[PDB]
Design a protein around this ligand. Sequence first.
Ligand SMILES: CSC[C@H]1O[C@@H](n2cnc3c(N)ncnc32)[C@H](O)[C@@H]1O
Ligand SMILES: CSC[C@H]1O[C@@H](n2cnc3c(N)ncnc32)[C@H](O)[C@@H]1O
Ligand SMILES: CSC[C@H]1O[C@@H](n2cnc3c(N)ncnc32)[C@H](O)[C@@H]1O
Ligand SMILES: CSC[C@H]1O[C@@H](n2cnc3c(N)ncnc32)[C@H](O)[C@@H]1O
Ligand SMILES: N=C(N)NCCCCNCCCN
Ligand SMILES: N=C(N)NCCCCNCCCN
Ligand SMILES: N=C(N)NCCCCNCCCN
Ligand SMILES: N=C(N)NCCCCNCCCN
Lengths: 286, 288, 288, 286
Amino acid sequence: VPGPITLIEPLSGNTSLLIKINAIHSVKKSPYQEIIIADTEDYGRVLILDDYIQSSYVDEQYYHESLVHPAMATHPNPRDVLILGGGEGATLREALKHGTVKRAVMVDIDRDVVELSRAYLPQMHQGAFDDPRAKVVIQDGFVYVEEAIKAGDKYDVIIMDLTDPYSSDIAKQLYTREFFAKIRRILNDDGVVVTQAGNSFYFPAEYDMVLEGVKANFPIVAEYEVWIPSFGYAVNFILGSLRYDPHALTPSEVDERLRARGVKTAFYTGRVHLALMNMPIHRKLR
Amino acid sequence: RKVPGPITLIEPLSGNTSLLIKINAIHSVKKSPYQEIIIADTEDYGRVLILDDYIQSSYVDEQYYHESLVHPAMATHPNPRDVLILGGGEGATLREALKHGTVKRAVMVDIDRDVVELSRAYLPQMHQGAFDDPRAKVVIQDGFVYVEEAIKAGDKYDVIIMDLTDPYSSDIAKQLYTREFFAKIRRILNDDGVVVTQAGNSFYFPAEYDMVLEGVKANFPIVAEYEVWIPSFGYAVNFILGSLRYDPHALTPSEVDERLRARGVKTAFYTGRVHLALMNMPIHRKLR
Amino acid sequence: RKVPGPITLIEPLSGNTSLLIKINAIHSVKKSPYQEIIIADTEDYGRVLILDDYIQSSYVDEQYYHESLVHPAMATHPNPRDVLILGGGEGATLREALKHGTVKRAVMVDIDRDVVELSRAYLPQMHQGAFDDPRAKVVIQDGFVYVEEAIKAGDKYDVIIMDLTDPYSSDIAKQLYTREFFAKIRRILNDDGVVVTQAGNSFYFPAEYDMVLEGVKANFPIVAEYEVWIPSFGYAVNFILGSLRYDPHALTPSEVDERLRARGVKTAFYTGRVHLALMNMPIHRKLR
Amino acid sequence: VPGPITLIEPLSGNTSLLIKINAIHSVKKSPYQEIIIADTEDYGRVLILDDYIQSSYVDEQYYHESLVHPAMATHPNPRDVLILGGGEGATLREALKHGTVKRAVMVDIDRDVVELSRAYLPQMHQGAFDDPRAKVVIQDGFVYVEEAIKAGDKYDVIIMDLTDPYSSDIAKQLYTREFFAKIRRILNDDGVVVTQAGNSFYFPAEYDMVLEGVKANFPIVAEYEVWIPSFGYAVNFILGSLRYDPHALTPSEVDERLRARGVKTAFYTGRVHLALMNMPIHRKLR
Ligand SMILES: CSC[C@H]1O[C@@H](n2cnc3c(N)ncnc32)[C@H](O)[C@@H]1O
Ligand SMILES: CSC[C@H]1O[C@@H](n2cnc3c(N)ncnc32)[C@H](O)[C@@H]1O
Ligand SMILES: CSC[C@H]1O[C@@H](n2cnc3c(N)ncnc32)[C@H](O)[C@@H]1O
Ligand SMILES: CSC[C@H]1O[C@@H](n2cnc3c(N)ncnc32)[C@H](O)[C@@H]1O
Ligand SMILES: N=C(N)NCCCCNCCCN
Ligand SMILES: N=C(N)NCCCCNCCCN
Ligand SMILES: N=C(N)NCCCCNCCCN
Ligand SMILES: N=C(N)NCCCCNCCCN
């Protein structure tokens, strides 16, 4: 049974996880959120923001590979990548594996998250922050995108790796119908966006809001989920595309693109892509 | 609420992780000779059956579990006529299996009459009448003894479904998860039979999962592994399907849909596309 | 068990400390217009009344609370004939006060009819029939309004006992803990009357305790403070006794015992020596 | 509500405390027990052994003053003091305050507890370990007492500050009828012993065992309790005496002896002594 020291991770308000803690590496009240870096018995080292595990050593690859590779593999030639959020650097790490990428920008609002990850979560970033193709910008992603529209900047793939749409005050403006209209303005004609969208089982209304926002703005929309043990649920992802349909990829085409681009993964393959494209998302059935 | 409450179920998960689940009502607590049984209403999952602290089934998500346990195996078999279920005390596994119009006879064997009776009384949306279907027979007995008696009598089944308490926590079910038990199961199958069992969770209990897998593989030439997230359990349940002839990997979505239609099977979840996803999604393991 | 369960009450204590208490059964849940009410069986404390997540009373330790609230005040008064109780919805305060043979009239005023009725039905060992004693009258009303009406009518009492929800957590009771309310209480006491109230807990809620104390002291020339550990609450409840004439500190153990004997009062806990200890034990405060 | 990081402190098996934690300073698996030093929001810094708070900054004085001063004040002239347990050094600190004390020996089985206290709990020991009157011995108190009998050592006051009689395997032999017969052999003819005895409300059987042990061996026995918020209950103490009755000591004589001996306290006074001597201990009443 978990203890003596335990993290109470909120899930739905009516369910939480109790997770044994072995050590606390750092506690920082930043201007934006409470940050803890801790060792858990089940999941190894974790980043926690306002009580929610954002990433764990033992299962973060399931999350980051699922967030990044379906979108990147769908795009025939992703050269410019924008990541909103992704403060521990693992999203950036996965995107940089695509040999086609020439420029990857990561924008997180919270310098303290980036710095504590640099120091305490080396297996997350694995040096991604210092890749010559990468640029790390500390700024509200909302301001960054408004500035990108003014400058006429364009991206092939935009990946949103933010705090949850059902809980997070700092991320709330980035999940609106209006924000997705802005995202479309900073994509190339054939660009793709992907975002995590919370959980459709526990937070259907907030999930549906994100979905309706993507659908209003993108003609091709794919929905898929993956169980992340440390979060207590299957994270929902929503992929919006302007031209290329992730459903049209065979396993063999996915594997071919990963091979050609030199991408090694612990999880994502062509067969995983096929399963993600065929598995309906969970909803409360009664 | 950060801490669900004021009344809460602490559901064990790994020993290092548990779920805290708000409870609205407790309908029955019964210490049976075999296990502690609670029937309760939860805010998130509706009514649940709990055995020794583990939710076995919830109103809002049980169809994910029971449809995943039953339909891949039944759809793989071109003509399942005789079905044996070990466990499945709330009656939902029986309910799913009986939907296959090809089934002529279904036997369900549970060790614990108190579970069956509390289900009869408190869980109508689980059994949905399945206990009293003229095709069905409910036998109260240790599934180990039942199978030994079946071998002696020369009984044979097309599909055997094991819906037991977990291999990592359950003393009463532990003998049914052995290499030797699966050799007995094979003795009560037809030459083209299929078995399916839940096998706990490969992420949190890899050693116990691996033991069950090794046991199935020792005894069956075709073995498919798949998992489905069951919110009320806190994890993706692992299933292992063992087959003597027919490969579930060979079925297209449209063949699955065709067989379900022909057999009159209606589901809330399982379809041909779900089948394809189950067959292609690798199971979760701790990666570091 | 390190984590009590499987079904558990999370009882708030300070906001930074809570109690986890194993539950065996839930007898009743009622969302009343005033508060959420649960009657439940706990393993450690037997049956409990819970209001908004806080145990108000338990079978195994309620006598510590009710005897401590009632007897020091009643024993201090040489001849309590008329008693008013504000709160005390389970009826145990009324039960203790009625034990004094001198009492001719006892009024109990609770704002929440659902608490009184559920206690009547599910907590018989609390009221023990007190609600139907010919000396008693049960009035359903906000104690604030009742006292305003008592002042208008010129009603007078010997002993007023306040058995309310906590001053640190309870919106419904908050107006009854003010300096102005205690001035009203004094207006419905005889010239030699006494009031007693529980005042939360000075260790975890010192500011709210201090506010109640300063309110009593503004209005009464004699003020005694005492506390008693109530296991089911997780802390030592603080009581504040305000008196117009008679000093509880002046009472010898022998005089307490003699008054209890003469009045036919039998107790499980309170005696003259307990009174001496209550009068000499300082209340707990955080020391660093 | 407590969290996100929480200590689950066991109480009865059917009740536990959930306590918010702010920091973890040290975790050490010693040969004898698991040790944690942590900061709690409600109780400040704590020493935890096998999941039970042994001492907290904000309330430890209630425990240590209650354990030590009734016994020491009852003895008209305590010169030699033996403490079994008391690894954080607070019991030693309280006993040394008595100006009459010439020699105070503290025997704890677990060097790691003493060393972590030295490092992390300065407000507990307050220098007591290095007082010239004090001697710290690392040893099982059972063996130490057997050796004291062989050497013919004698003490005025023996204070037992061990882990609980209802939970602790390492301390179990020190709570027996036979152990108290040994304790009597290393007391002067007017000596006194005092021990904590768990809790009579939640653990009546184990309390009754300790009481029967003391009563078998000492003609005067006083029982008293004090609520220690951080433990979740009123600790029971049992004081055994060969000559002097703590019941006979008046508030004014207690105050006089404390003054004469230069003892300053945050809690214990003559009136507290009177209350402790008159308050019956808690039991389940139904
Ligand atoms: C750890 S992955 C989630 C990240 O999203 C970042 N985040 C939250 N809201 C915003 C925002 N409005 N703009 C950019 N990053 C954000 C958080 O600082 C966190 O590091
Ligand atoms: C509720 S689904 C799990 C069911 O498996 C049942 N079960 C556990 N062990 C055995 C066994 N050895 N034989 C038959 N049923 C069992 C339990 O009684 C439960 O009803
Ligand atoms: C169970 S003892 C506490 C009781 O105080 C009662 N109470 C709380 N606030 C008030 C109030 N303003 N007037 C009268 N009774 C009250 C509550 O209904 C509860 O039954
Ligand atoms: C912190 S106070 C309790 C102390 O009692 C000590 N203790 C427990 N059992 C024994 C024993 N058998 N002999 C000496 N000390 C002990 C523990 O190491 C702890 O430091
Ligand atoms: N426990 C939860 N509810 N977690 C939600 C975390 C997902 C937000 N991205 C963070 C992952 C960073 N790569
Ligand atoms: N909470 C859990 N770990 N549950 C284990 C799942 C129960 C397996 N058979 C019962 C399913 C009902 N037919
Ligand atoms: N924190 C707590 N658990 N407090 C409950 C205190 C009881 C106040 N009403 C009186 C109790 C019923 N007579
Ligand atoms: N259940 C509990 N929390 N009990 C801890 C009691 C501490 C016993 N001796 C150590 C006291 C510190 N000197």
